[PDB]
Design an enzyme around this catalytic site. Structure first.
Site, PDB file in Angstrom:
ATOM      1  N   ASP A 162      -6.342 -11.098  -1.879  1.00  0.00           N
ATOM      2  CA  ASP A 162      -6.901  -9.978  -0.803  1.00  0.00           C
ATOM      3  C   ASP A 162      -8.199  -9.863  -0.611  1.00  0.00           C
ATOM      4  O   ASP A 162      -8.596  -8.773  -1.617  1.00  0.00           O
ATOM      5  CB  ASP A 162      -5.694  -8.871  -1.054  1.00  0.00           C
ATOM      6  CG  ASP A 162      -5.619  -7.820  -0.161  1.00  0.00           C
ATOM      7  OD1 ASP A 162      -6.467  -7.802   0.886  1.00  0.00           O
ATOM      8  OD2 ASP A 162      -4.920  -6.723  -0.330  1.00  0.00           O
ATOM      9  N   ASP A 218      -9.879  -9.749   5.970  1.00  0.00           N
ATOM     10  CA  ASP A 218      -8.561  -9.023   5.291  1.00  0.00           C
ATOM     11  C   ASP A 218      -7.715 -10.052   4.917  1.00  0.00           C
ATOM     12  O   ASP A 218      -6.619 -10.142   5.915  1.00  0.00           O
ATOM     13  CB  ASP A 218      -8.285  -7.737   5.905  1.00  0.00           C
ATOM     14  CG  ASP A 218      -7.449  -7.216   4.982  1.00  0.00           C
ATOM     15  OD1 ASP A 218      -6.809  -7.730   3.980  1.00  0.00           O
ATOM     16  OD2 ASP A 218      -6.713  -6.149   5.472  1.00  0.00           O
TER      17      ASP A 218
HETATM   18  C1  PP6 Z   1      -6.980   0.295   1.834  1.00  0.00           C
HETATM   19  O1  PP6 Z   1      -7.347  -0.997   2.178  1.00  0.00           O
HETATM   20  C2  PP6 Z   1      -5.974  -1.830   2.533  1.00  0.00           C
HETATM   21  O2  PP6 Z   1      -4.943  -1.180   2.146  1.00  0.00           O
HETATM   22  C3  PP6 Z   1      -6.199  -3.016   2.878  1.00  0.00           C
HETATM   23  C4  PP6 Z   1      -7.331  -3.363   4.222  1.00  0.00           C
HETATM   24  C5  PP6 Z   1      -6.759  -2.464   5.311  1.00  0.00           C
HETATM   25  C6  PP6 Z   1      -7.238  -1.155   5.788  1.00  0.00           C
HETATM   26  C7  PP6 Z   1      -6.632  -0.289   6.461  1.00  0.00           C
HETATM   27  C8  PP6 Z   1      -5.793  -0.877   7.568  1.00  0.00           C
HETATM   28  C9  PP6 Z   1      -5.320  -1.934   7.118  1.00  0.00           C
HETATM   29  C10 PP6 Z   1      -5.549  -2.754   5.940  1.00  0.00           C
HETATM   30  O3  PP6 Z   1      -5.253  -3.589   3.095  1.00  0.00           O
HETATM   31  P1  PP6 Z   1      -4.579  -4.895   2.519  1.00  0.00           P
HETATM   32  O4  PP6 Z   1      -4.896  -4.769   0.973  1.00  0.00           O
HETATM   33  O5  PP6 Z   1      -4.865  -6.009   3.080  1.00  0.00           O
HETATM   34  C11 PP6 Z   1      -2.478  -4.603   2.602  1.00  0.00           C
HETATM   35  C12 PP6 Z   1      -2.015  -5.515   1.467  1.00  0.00           C
HETATM   36  C13 PP6 Z   1      -0.589  -5.219   1.447  1.00  0.00           C
HETATM   37  C14 PP6 Z   1       0.284  -4.414   0.638  1.00  0.00           C
HETATM   38  C15 PP6 Z   1       1.404  -4.145   0.711  1.00  0.00           C
HETATM   39  C16 PP6 Z   1       2.155  -4.711   1.889  1.00  0.00           C
HETATM   40  C17 PP6 Z   1       3.740  -4.469   2.003  1.00  0.00           C
HETATM   41  C18 PP6 Z   1       4.396  -4.983   2.843  1.00  0.00           C
HETATM   42  C19 PP6 Z   1       3.702  -5.937   3.777  1.00  0.00           C
HETATM   43  C20 PP6 Z   1       2.325  -6.332   3.649  1.00  0.00           C
HETATM   44  C21 PP6 Z   1       1.825  -5.659   2.662  1.00  0.00           C
HETATM   45  C22 PP6 Z   1       0.242  -5.713   2.700  1.00  0.00           C
HETATM   46  C23 PP6 Z   1       1.817  -7.097   4.739  1.00  0.00           C
HETATM   47  C24 PP6 Z   1       0.905  -6.433   5.512  1.00  0.00           C
HETATM   48  O6  PP6 Z   1      -0.005  -7.247   6.281  1.00  0.00           O
HETATM   49  N1  PP6 Z   1       0.471  -5.169   5.314  1.00  0.00           N
HETATM   50  C25 PP6 Z   1      -1.059  -4.310   5.822  1.00  0.00           C
HETATM   51  C26 PP6 Z   1      -0.619  -3.368   6.835  1.00  0.00           C
HETATM   52  C27 PP6 Z   1      -1.894  -2.729   7.114  1.00  0.00           C
HETATM   53  C28 PP6 Z   1       0.047  -4.137   8.107  1.00  0.00           C
HETATM   54  C29 PP6 Z   1      -1.352  -4.145   4.561  1.00  0.00           C
HETATM   55  O7  PP6 Z   1      -1.111  -3.143   4.101  1.00  0.00           O
HETATM   56  N2  PP6 Z   1      -2.436  -4.842   3.815  1.00  0.00           N
END
Ligand code: PP6
Ligand code: PP6
Ligand code: MAN
Ligand code: MAN
Ligand code: MAN
Ligand code: MAN
Lengths: 323, 323
Positions: free
Chosen positions: B33, B213
């Protein structure tokens, strides 16, 4: 330019110090913490039963939500808290931060539920360590810093008396003599500084680093230093129910000092008797273990002996004996 | 100098990509990630029932505990995880990080419990946003960076085929033409970059910023852009059970592109059909809302169209069409 004086008041035995903070027009009693960069509060998002015995922030009326933002903190004692975020008006000592991030609690662990003396914590460490996701927020101090007459705050914590957080100016009547400054290393977000040596009663030893931390009740040092201190205290023994080393309340405790940039910060033995241990008839020691972390925690026991200036210019810390 | 190729494999519909990582001699399947700076794993500290269906890190055998340290993460979807920390040997693509901080899970929320496809996440964002308390730790990449032949990694995520994470070198056979670089703003710890404009099918509009990301399945854009995209997709409608906009699987989807430092990164409409929505007979759109956060999330849907170089020197991101 702004400045203000926020008055703090210790709870029983000076376990913590509370200072009122008006958020969206509601005044909450917060624990100001120079070891944290979060401003988190009990809120209407907690279960009603957890709100009882507290003043709580109600974001619906005045806050602007940062949709999608979260925060969460976890402590080595096993405590934790987490929630969501809103910006609002936050006033401390007459100084208002507009648009300040307020971390509303949705979950809090037992230690926080049980302490009805505060409604949350107001962080004064560097903003680089604020926990808000996905983009970290600025502390109250960082928010107002450029509006202050000088970009600093200072603190006088006292034993069983009210004290102050001075924002934006230095109150020279709060200490004896002149301040001595030392450089701060903010790389871990803390007000970290170096000591050249320490003297625990009759024993002196090598220097180390530590952090000025109003959010920690006691003075936490390496186990070796704690052992040398208590080796000089007759009858001292550990009591995990109490929090560590305890001893008869009438004991005459040695002083403890550290040398900082040529200035000797002395904590008199009187201030090392924290108070009743709350486990029978002994008193708790103000000095305890830092549990192996490799740096010292200059908590309230130490701070009660000094006036301390937290200057963002440097950054640097100034110390002098509290008056 | 070191380098290595770690092979990633998408789960069904490319919901995530897993890459094996050997920690203290046990191989776990982790979700790499670039939007996180934490390396957290299912561990023997979880309840046994939560360990089932996973490979788990057993710190007792090989890890060095950082006593008193904790970590905790909270997501806008309501997921969370937290635990303690140990250092251990962590090998990815044949490149070993000695003394790497491994955040062992003690608590995990339902979304993580339910996904048996991974055993945790390996963060590749900047270390400044690592959540470990009281002192933050370095990511696997930051730990090994100076030992690599070049302080960069690169990624090819593919649709229903294995891909790679290249550490320490660029594989030019993974893209067509030459790479185009753009500056990265790491002030929030992300691989954030600017786009000068976008073209959603027949509509073009103003630029914005976003983050590369790998941990996000879809391409998340401002609601206005999402609306303009789906306004061109016949029959498109939102289905909250599915994850957002869905449409008949046979629909001919428009392409979506962004201009980055003069290079046009095009996501073909074929890649915008994520797959079966899992709610009757429709398909889920690869483009969805960023939920008002004010910056875009260049997740897997977008990355599948490009080879992307994450270069710490600058820092900067390089892009070219995936070959
Ligand atoms: C604080 O930074 C984050 O959480 C970073 C970057 C970020 C910042 C802002 C908005 C979105 C993403 O997300 P990540 O570590 O890649 C984070 C990793 C992550 C964590 C738990 C999750 C639980 C269920 C589903 C997903 C997950 C993905 C698929 C999904 O794409 N989820 C997205 C959401 C946004 C739809 C997500 O939460 N991804
Ligand atoms: C990540 O930084 C901290 O948590 C900072 C700095 C720090 C760093 C390392 C060691 C100790 C302190 O602690 P703090 O915000 O001031 C943090 C504030 C805090 C949070 C929850 C608490 C729950 C019960 C009791 C106390 C609490 C204090 C009294 C106490 O002094 N507790 C100490 C422990 C150390 C005895 C404490 O956890 N204090
Ligand atoms: C703190 O300092 C400011 C600026 O010098 C004053 O205006 C204020 O009233 C207080 O003394
Ligand atoms: C808080 O209260 C103290 C003690 O009354 C004052 O001195 C301070 O200025 C602030 O009002
Ligand atoms: C990656 O690059 C290194 C250094 O150039 C090689 O030694 C390695 O085998 C791989 O091709
Ligand atoms: C992972 O597996 C891929 C596909 O077999 C290899 O190409 C890669 O080098 C790594 O071994």
């Amino acid at each position: 330019a702004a400045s203000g004086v926020a008055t703090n008041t210790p709870t029983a035995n000076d376990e913590e110090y509370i200072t009122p903070v008006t958020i969206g027009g509601t005044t909450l009693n917060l624990n100001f913490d120079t070891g944290s960069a979060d401003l988190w509060v009990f809120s209407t998002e907690l279960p009603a039963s957890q709100q009882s015995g507290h003043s709580v922030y109600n974001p619906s009326a005045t806050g602007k939500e940062l949709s999608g933002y979260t925060w969460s903190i976890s402590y080595g004692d096993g405590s934790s808290a987490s929630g969501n975020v809103f910006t609002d008006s936050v006033t401390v000592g007459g100084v208002t931060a507009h648009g300040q991030a307020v971390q509303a609690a949705q979950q809090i662990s037992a230690q926080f539920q049980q302490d009805t003396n505060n409604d949350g914590l107001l962080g004064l460490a560097f903003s680089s360590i604020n926990t808000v996701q996905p983009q970290s927020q600025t502390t109250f101090f960082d928010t107002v810093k450029s509006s202050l007459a000088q970009p600093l705050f200072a603190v006088a914590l006292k034993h069983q008396q009210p004290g102050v957080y001075d924002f934006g100016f230095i109150d020279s009547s709060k200490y004896t003599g002149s301040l001595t400054y030392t450089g701060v290393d903010n790389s871990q977000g803390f007000w970290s500084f170096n000591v050249d040596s320490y003297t625990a009663g009759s024993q002196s030893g090598d220097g180390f680093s530590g952090i000025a931390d109003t959010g920690t009740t006691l003075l936490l040092l390496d186990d070796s230093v704690v052992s040398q201190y208590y080796s000089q205290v007759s009858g001292a023994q550990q009591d995990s129910n109490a929090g560590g080393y305890v001893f008869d309340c009438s004991t005459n405790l040695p002083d403890f000092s550290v040398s900082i940039s040529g200035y000797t910060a002395t904590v008199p033995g009187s201030l090392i008797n924290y108070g009743p241990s709350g486990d029978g008839s002994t008193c708790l020691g103000g000095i305890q273990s830092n549990s192996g972390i490799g740096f010292s925690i200059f908590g309230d026991i130490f701070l009660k002996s000094q006036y301390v200036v937290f200057d963002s210019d440097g950054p640097q810390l100034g110390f002098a004996p509290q008056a």
